[PDB]
Design an enzyme around this catalytic site. Structure first.
Site, PDB file in Angstrom:
ATOM      1  N   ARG A  84      -7.506   1.628  11.507  1.00 32.18           N
ATOM      2  CA  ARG A  84      -7.377   0.109  11.387  1.00 32.18           C
ATOM      3  C   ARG A  84      -6.485  -0.177  12.598  1.00 32.18           C
ATOM      4  NH1 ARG A  84      -3.853  -2.480   9.293  1.00 32.18           N
ATOM      5  NH2 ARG A  84      -3.292  -0.864   7.701  1.00 32.18           N
ATOM      6  N   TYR A 232     -14.521   2.901  12.768  1.00 30.22           N
ATOM      7  CA  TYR A 232     -13.512   3.380  11.832  1.00 30.22           C
ATOM      8  C   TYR A 232     -12.873   2.825  10.498  1.00 30.22           C
ATOM      9  CZ  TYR A 232      -9.753   6.974  10.694  1.00 30.22           C
ATOM     10  OH  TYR A 232      -8.909   7.696   9.927  1.00 30.22           O
ATOM     11  N   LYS A 241     -10.748  -3.874   3.745  1.00 29.87           N
ATOM     12  CA  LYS A 241      -9.534  -4.615   4.031  1.00 29.87           C
ATOM     13  C   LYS A 241     -10.213  -6.055   4.476  1.00 29.87           C
ATOM     14  CE  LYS A 241      -6.484  -1.552   3.575  1.00 29.87           C
ATOM     15  NZ  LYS A 241      -5.620  -1.224   2.411  1.00 29.87           N
ATOM     16  N   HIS A 261      -2.983  -5.708  -2.493  1.00 30.96           N
ATOM     17  CA  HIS A 261      -2.979  -4.335  -1.798  1.00 30.96           C
ATOM     18  C   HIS A 261      -2.039  -3.526  -2.626  1.00 30.96           C
ATOM     19  CE1 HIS A 261      -1.719  -1.677   1.926  1.00 30.96           C
ATOM     20  NE2 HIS A 261      -2.741  -1.211   0.949  1.00 30.96           N
ATOM     21  N   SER A 283       1.207   1.198   3.390  1.00 34.15           N
ATOM     22  CA  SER A 283       0.504   2.223   3.797  1.00 34.15           C
ATOM     23  C   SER A 283       1.546   3.261   3.965  1.00 34.15           C
ATOM     24  CB  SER A 283      -0.053   2.181   5.424  1.00 34.15           C
ATOM     25  OG  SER A 283      -1.388   1.636   5.347  1.00 34.15           O
ATOM     26  N   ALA A 284       1.524   4.640   3.823  1.00 32.45           N
ATOM     27  CA  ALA A 284       2.240   5.639   4.209  1.00 32.45           C
ATOM     28  C   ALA A 284       3.389   5.658   3.186  1.00 32.45           C
ATOM     29  CB  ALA A 284       2.935   5.792   5.541  1.00 32.45           C
ATOM     30  N   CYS A 285       3.263   5.028   2.077  1.00 30.36           N
ATOM     31  CA  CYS A 285       4.379   4.791   1.014  1.00 30.36           C
ATOM     32  C   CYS A 285       3.743   4.956  -0.410  1.00 30.36           C
ATOM     33  CB  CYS A 285       4.750   3.140   1.134  1.00 30.36           C
ATOM     34  SG  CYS A 285       5.774   2.763   2.631  1.00 30.36           S
ATOM     35  N   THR A 288      -1.376   6.022  -3.326  1.00 36.41           N
ATOM     36  CA  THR A 288      -2.590   6.987  -3.973  1.00 36.41           C
ATOM     37  C   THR A 288      -1.776   8.164  -4.820  1.00 36.41           C
ATOM     38  OG1 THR A 288      -4.046   6.138  -2.273  1.00 36.41           O
ATOM     39  CG2 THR A 288      -4.171   8.434  -3.319  1.00 36.41           C
ATOM     40  N   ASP A 308      -5.834   1.275  -4.033  1.00 37.03           N
ATOM     41  CA  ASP A 308      -5.553   0.315  -2.831  1.00 37.03           C
ATOM     42  C   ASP A 308      -5.626  -1.030  -3.035  1.00 37.03           C
ATOM     43  OD1 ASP A 308      -4.975   0.978   0.100  1.00 37.03           O
ATOM     44  OD2 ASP A 308      -6.970  -0.158   0.258  1.00 37.03           O
ATOM     45  N   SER A 401      -6.027  10.523   9.349  1.00 35.86           N
ATOM     46  CA  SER A 401      -7.039  11.179   8.910  1.00 35.86           C
ATOM     47  C   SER A 401      -7.285  10.785   7.265  1.00 35.86           C
ATOM     48  CB  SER A 401      -7.201  12.598   9.077  1.00 35.86           C
ATOM     49  OG  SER A 401      -6.217  13.307   8.763  1.00 35.86           O
ATOM     50  N   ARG A 402      -8.445  10.703   7.023  1.00 38.05           N
ATOM     51  CA  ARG A 402      -8.808  10.214   5.511  1.00 38.05           C
ATOM     52  C   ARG A 402      -9.874  11.284   4.769  1.00 38.05           C
ATOM     53  NH1 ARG A 402      -5.851   5.591   3.650  1.00 38.05           N
ATOM     54  NH2 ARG A 402      -4.640   4.810   5.637  1.00 38.05           N
ATOM     55  N   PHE A 520       7.038  12.153  -6.745  1.00 36.52           N
ATOM     56  CA  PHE A 520       5.677  12.388  -7.117  1.00 36.52           C
ATOM     57  C   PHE A 520       5.745  12.521  -8.777  1.00 36.52           C
ATOM     58  CE2 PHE A 520       6.726  14.021  -2.762  1.00 36.52           C
ATOM     59  CZ  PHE A 520       5.782  13.537  -2.050  1.00 36.52           C
ATOM     60  N   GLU A 522       7.496  13.316 -10.910  1.00 36.33           N
ATOM     61  CA  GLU A 522       8.602  13.102 -11.361  1.00 36.33           C
ATOM     62  C   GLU A 522       9.074  11.579 -11.648  1.00 36.33           C
ATOM     63  OE1 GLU A 522      10.156  15.290 -12.974  1.00 36.33           O
ATOM     64  OE2 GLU A 522       9.745  17.305 -11.710  1.00 36.33           O
TER      65      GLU A 522
HETATM   66  N1  LIG Z   1       9.567  11.234  -1.084  1.00 38.46           N
HETATM   67  C1  LIG Z   1       8.663  10.793  -1.574  1.00 38.46           C
HETATM   68  N2  LIG Z   1       7.401  10.876  -0.753  1.00 38.46           N
HETATM   69  C2  LIG Z   1       6.365  10.436  -1.324  1.00 38.46           C
HETATM   70  C3  LIG Z   1       6.106   9.962  -2.766  1.00 38.46           C
HETATM   71  N3  LIG Z   1       4.954   9.563  -2.999  1.00 38.46           N
HETATM   72  C4  LIG Z   1       4.291   9.563  -1.731  1.00 38.46           C
HETATM   73  N4  LIG Z   1       4.901   9.874  -0.946  1.00 38.46           N
HETATM   74  C5  LIG Z   1       4.730  10.149   0.675  1.00 38.46           C
HETATM   75  O1  LIG Z   1       3.880   9.008   0.962  1.00 38.46           O
HETATM   76  C6  LIG Z   1       2.642   9.616   1.961  1.00 38.46           C
HETATM   77  C7  LIG Z   1       1.552   9.248   1.466  1.00 38.46           C
HETATM   78  O2  LIG Z   1       1.394   7.969   1.034  1.00 38.46           O
HETATM   79  P1  LIG Z   1      -0.216   7.271   1.711  1.00 38.46           P
HETATM   80  O3  LIG Z   1      -1.312   7.891   0.966  1.00 38.46           O
HETATM   81  O4  LIG Z   1       0.067   7.182   3.455  1.00 38.46           O
HETATM   82  O5  LIG Z   1       0.125   5.728   1.007  1.00 38.46           O
HETATM   83  P2  LIG Z   1      -0.863   4.909   0.409  1.00 38.46           P
HETATM   84  O6  LIG Z   1       0.138   3.767  -0.031  1.00 38.46           O
HETATM   85  O7  LIG Z   1      -1.623   5.328  -0.354  1.00 38.46           O
HETATM   86  O8  LIG Z   1      -1.638   4.136   1.796  1.00 38.46           O
HETATM   87  P3  LIG Z   1      -2.903   3.396   2.421  1.00 38.46           P
HETATM   88  O9  LIG Z   1      -3.972   4.268   1.482  1.00 38.46           O
HETATM   89  O10 LIG Z   1      -2.924   3.752   3.850  1.00 38.46           O
HETATM   90  O11 LIG Z   1      -2.981   2.049   1.756  1.00 38.46           O
HETATM   91  C8  LIG Z   1       3.329  10.804   2.127  1.00 38.46           C
HETATM   92  O12 LIG Z   1       4.136  10.958   3.357  1.00 38.46           O
HETATM   93  C9  LIG Z   1       3.942  11.360   0.992  1.00 38.46           C
HETATM   94  O13 LIG Z   1       4.924  12.471   1.194  1.00 38.46           O
HETATM   95  C10 LIG Z   1       7.114  10.210  -3.359  1.00 38.46           C
HETATM   96  O14 LIG Z   1       7.268  10.050  -4.623  1.00 38.46           O
HETATM   97  N5  LIG Z   1       8.504  10.611  -2.858  1.00 38.46           N
HETATM   98  O1  LIG Z   2      -4.055   0.878   6.043  1.00 42.51           O
HETATM   99  C1  LIG Z   2      -4.593   0.803   4.654  1.00 42.51           C
HETATM  100  O2  LIG Z   2      -3.659   0.546   3.769  1.00 42.51           O
HETATM  101  C2  LIG Z   2      -5.582   1.566   4.144  1.00 42.51           C
HETATM  102  O3  LIG Z   2      -5.886   1.763   2.989  1.00 42.51           O
HETATM  103  C3  LIG Z   2      -6.624   2.139   5.385  1.00 42.51           C
HETATM  104  S1  LIG Z   2      -7.857   1.279   6.094  1.00 42.51           S
HETATM  105  O4  LIG Z   2      -8.511   0.818   5.001  1.00 42.51           O
HETATM  106  O5  LIG Z   2      -7.152  -0.020   6.563  1.00 42.51           O
HETATM  107  O6  LIG Z   2      -8.297   1.946   7.183  1.00 42.51           O
HETATM  108 MN   LIG Z   3      -3.933   5.502  -0.403  1.00 45.39          MN
HETATM  109 MN   LIG Z   4      -4.243   0.356   2.139  1.00 45.24          MN
END
Ligand SMILES: Nc1nc2c(ncn2[C@@H]2O[C@H](COP(=O)(O)OP(=O)(O)OP(=O)(O)O)[C@@H](O)[C@H]2O)c(=O)[nH]1
Ligand SMILES: O=C(O)C(=O)CS(=O)(=O)O
Ligand SMILES: [Mn+2]
Ligand SMILES: [Mn+2]
Ligand SMILES: [Mn+2]
Ligand code: NA
Length: 612
Positions: A84, A232, A241, A261, A283-285, A288, A308, A401-402, A520, A522
């Site tokens: 994106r 993509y 989105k 979101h 994202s990245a937090c 999922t 999501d 990657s997805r 995770f 926990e």
């Molecule tokens: N330390 C820690 N890291 C976590 C935890 N849950 C998820 N993560 C981290 O979060 C990242 C995965 O989250 P993503 O799938 O990118 O997050 P998302 O919110 O689903 O993102 P989008 O799909 O892009 O909206 C990895 O770096 C994991 O290690 C947790 O409970 N503790």
């Molecule tokens: O970026 C996000 O929060 C996503 O879930 C991936 S995308 O659908 O924007 O490609």
């Molecule tokens: Mn996700």
């Molecule tokens: Mn998202």
């Protein structure tokens, strides 16, 4: 017609233009006239259609079959088109202020407005003739269960078979949607990869895209999404989105609901009581990971409604009912392992499309953080289609990657995940990556305080801590100040049962850079505390930032090594800085549209910190 250039019936290779509702036909034929596809395929959503399109993509070198799994597939993209792309994502309105607040001193970080005039020029420089030599696929789709009062219908025109396949997974698509729609309203979604035939530029990795002219536009007043040049994810799968956050947040504002979101999960305790929760992390937090959690606490169960996007509306009884408008999970692959997301691992081994992951020599998938050894002999091809060794400097999979997998396959998919009435949300959770200062969990003091907590969200991107209010910074369909006012107005809805608001931090680190909390599964222990607080349990202690768990309120059995004092520490010095940064941000970025109540919550928090 006086000639034979406006009726496209002769080019239809599946379906019938005559079968379509009048306005759907006008949308299809008008864009066929513009883009000049060779053929028009009206999708029916059938397994036959899906099977055959996959095999066609396979024939063309566009996807590979992953022979280790049941009907799983791999696409490797042009490295220019991997994500994106916010910098080329715009919203068109008459007045800029309706899309973003006019900032006091700076450039807006809350959206990217483009004028109608500028968009018309951009559109005319892109779309005329763009599908020459290609099939225009017509994707009729429902965001939400078919028949839900909360669902909305879209039609996506695309020249990408990859988009068709992925949209079958991520939305409910095909003939039943046309039948459900009839003469109703629908969101007009137009997509082209921007590579008319004959190709004017080299095709890289059999992945059609036009990075120089990439533009993802939203025209909320016309109920249109227009996307050019990227194949993509969020740029091309327009339901996700584009529709279900940007367009839908504007619709939500107009109609009295919310488009967010957020994951939605159901959690059941050892006393057979179930509550639904929603959570907004960037994202990245880890949305999922949470949405699909395998809880470590005995007698607790988590089930997934969505991971999501949530659409939420108060009903006449005052319950906040949420649906997942998606039909699958478009999850980040790297970091997904048996320990971080065992339910995803189960879900993605059939009927799943992977994009930009590595491939093992036995036809399996690989990525950073898969945490799973390969047998001696098994080798890896990277996402760049090159031989790759674990000791190499580059990652085997792209970091974004997805996987794209059906929701119905998830072994913990909630029994009400397609209930047309939605599920009743009892708590909303905010959170991001904060390595310092922010406790594991706290609870807002009021609805107004909680809207402020959403507004104040920040998250780590040299490390940079950026603002990402409500996890919506990339996704606001309209002025963020007005979005705040919309959330605040929910308190004045007669009979509303306002959910409890929490903020979490999975990511606090000690002085050596080590995570203080194991996270995770926990995180179920944090969910347990939230659960009790929703029930009224006397488990909370007041602090300057909100309520936190009392000493001994969290179940820490089986952990024992956890430093609760550092994990829940609240520093006056840190929080003074924090409030200043939030103040400066809201003043610049929301400016004349900052609601009174949010300014008041800012003042109240500064005042509470001042008495430490
Ligand atoms: N330390 C820690 N890291 C976590 C935890 N849950 C998820 N993560 C981290 O979060 C990242 C995965 O989250 P993503 O799938 O990118 O997050 P998302 O919110 O689903 O993102 P989008 O799909 O892009 O909206 C990895 O770096 C994991 O290690 C947790 O409970 N503790
Ligand atoms: O970026 C996000 O929060 C996503 O879930 C991936 S995308 O659908 O924007 O490609
Ligand atoms: Mn996700
Ligand atoms: Mn998202
Ligand atoms: Mn009020
Ligand atoms: Na490819």
């Amino acid at each position: 017609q006086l000639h034979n250039g406006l009726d496209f019936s002769a080019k239809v290779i599946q379906g019938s233009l005559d079968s379509l509702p009048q306005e759907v036909r006008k949308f299809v034929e008008g864009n066929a006239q513009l883009c000049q596809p060779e053929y028009i395929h009206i999708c029916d959503g059938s397994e036959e259609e899906y099977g055959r399109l996959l095999a066609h993509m396979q024939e063309e070198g566009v996807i590979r079959k992953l022979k280790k799994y049941d009907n799983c597939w791999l696409a490797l993209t042009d490295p220019r088109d991997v994500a994106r792309i916010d910098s080329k994502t715009v919203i068109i309105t008459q007045e800029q202020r309706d899309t973003v607040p006019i900032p006091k001193s700076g450039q807006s970080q809350l959206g990217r407005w483009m004028s109608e005039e500028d968009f018309e020029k951009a559109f005319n420089a892109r779309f005329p003739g763009c599908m020459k030599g290609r099939t225009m696929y017509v994707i009729p789709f429902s965001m939400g269960p078919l028949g839900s009062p909360l669902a909305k219908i879209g039609i996506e025109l695309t020249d990408s078979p990859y988009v068709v396949a992925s949209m079958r997974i991520m939305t409910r698509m095909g003939t039943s949607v046309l039948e459900a729609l009839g003469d109703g309203e629908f969101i007009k979604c137009l997509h082209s990869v921007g590579c008319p035939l004959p190709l004017k530029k080299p095709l890289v990795n059999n992945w059609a895209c036009n990075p120089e002219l990439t533009l993802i536009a939203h025209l909320p007043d016309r109920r249109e999404i227009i996307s050019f040049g990227s194949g993509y994810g969020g740029n091309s799968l327009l339901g996700k989105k584009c529709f279900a956050l940007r367009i839908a947040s504007r619709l939500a504002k107009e109609e009295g609901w919310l488009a967010e979101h957020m994951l939605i999960l159901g959690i059941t305790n050892p006393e057979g009581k179930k509550k639904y929760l929603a959570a907004a992390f960037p994202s990245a937090c880890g949305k999922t990971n949470l949405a699909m959690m395998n809880p470590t606490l005995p007698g607790w169960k988590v089930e997934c409604v969505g991971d999501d996007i949530a659409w939420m509306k108060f009903d006449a009884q005052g319950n906040l009912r949420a649906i997942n408008p998606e039909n699958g999970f478009f999850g980040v692959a790297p970091g997904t392992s048996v320990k971080t997301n065992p339910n995803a691992i189960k879900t993605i081994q059939k009927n799943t499309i992977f994009t930009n992951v590595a491939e093992t020599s036995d036809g399996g998938v690989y990525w950073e953080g898969i945490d799973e050894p390969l047998a001696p002999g098994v080798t890896i091809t990277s996402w760049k289609n090159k031989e790759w060794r674990p000791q190499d400097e580059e990652p085997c999979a792209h970091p974004n990657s997805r996987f794209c997998t059906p929701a119905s396959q998830c072994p913990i998919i909630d029994p009400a995940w397609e209930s047309p009435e939605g599920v009743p949300i009892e708590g909303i959770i905010f959170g991001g990556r904060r390595p310092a200062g922010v406790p594991l969990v706290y609870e807002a003091l009021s609805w107004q305080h909680g809207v402020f907590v959403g507004a104040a969200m920040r998250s780590e991107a040299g490390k940079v801590i950026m603002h990402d209010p409500f996890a919506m910074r990339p996704f606001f369909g309209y002025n963020f100040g007005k979005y705040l006012a919309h959330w605040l107005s929910m308190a004045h809805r007669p009979a509303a049962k306002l959910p409890k608001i929490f903020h979490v931090n999975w990511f606090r680190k000690d002085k050596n850079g080590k995570f203080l909390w194991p996270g995770f599964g926990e995180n179920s222990r944090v969910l347990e505390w939230m659960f009790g607080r929703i029930e009224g349990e006397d488990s909370a202690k007041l602090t300057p930032i909100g309520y936190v768990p009392k000493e001994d309120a969290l179940n820490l059995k089986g952990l024992g090594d956890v430093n609760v004092e550092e994990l829940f520490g609240i520093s006056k010095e840190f929080w003074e800085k924090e409030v200043e940064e939030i103040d400066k941000y809201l003043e610049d970025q929301v400016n004349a549209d900052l609601p009174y109540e949010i300014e008041r919550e800012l003042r109240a928090l500064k005042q509470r910190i001042s008495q430490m």
